């Protein structure tokens, strides 16, 4: 398996979201994306929830996340696995919706992920 580089997709006041990709050779239709949330700010992240969506031609499942909190100052990250099936090799598009609390603010972020590697779907 050739390695596919991680993609940093979001940063806000010290909170970051990062994507990692795996394309198992033994199942070409399959893409496994791991989102990883880190926090280097002075305040905990709480109630973290990530939702995702792909084009209708693809199928998406989310595994339960490792947790809903990311402690301040480089605390334990949250990881969450996305399972995507794409047998027709349609261009991968991915949008994310994040909600969490941080510095006593309710954060709501939604965006389409740009610069997805072609290796994640070809």
């Amino acid at each position: 398996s050739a390695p596919i580089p991680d993609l940093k997709v979001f940063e806000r006041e010290g909170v970051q979201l990062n994507l990692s990709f795996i394309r198992p050779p033994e199942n070409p239709a399959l893409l496994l994306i791991t989102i990883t949330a880190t926090n280097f700010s002075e305040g905990d992240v709480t109630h973290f929830i990530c939702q995702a969506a792909v084009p209708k031609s693809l199928q998406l499942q989310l595994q339960a996340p490792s947790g809903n909190t990311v402690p301040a100052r480089g605390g334990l990250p949250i990881t969450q696995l996305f399972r995507i099936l794409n047998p027709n090799k349609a261009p991968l598009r991915l949008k994310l919706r994040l909600t969490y609390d941080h510095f006593h603010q309710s954060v709501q972020e939604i965006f389409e992920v740009n610069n997805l590697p072609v290796e994640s779907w070809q």
Partner: peptide, 6 residues
Amino acid sequence: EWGPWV
């Protein structure tokens, strides 16, 4: 065109 939020 887009699927549901998961």
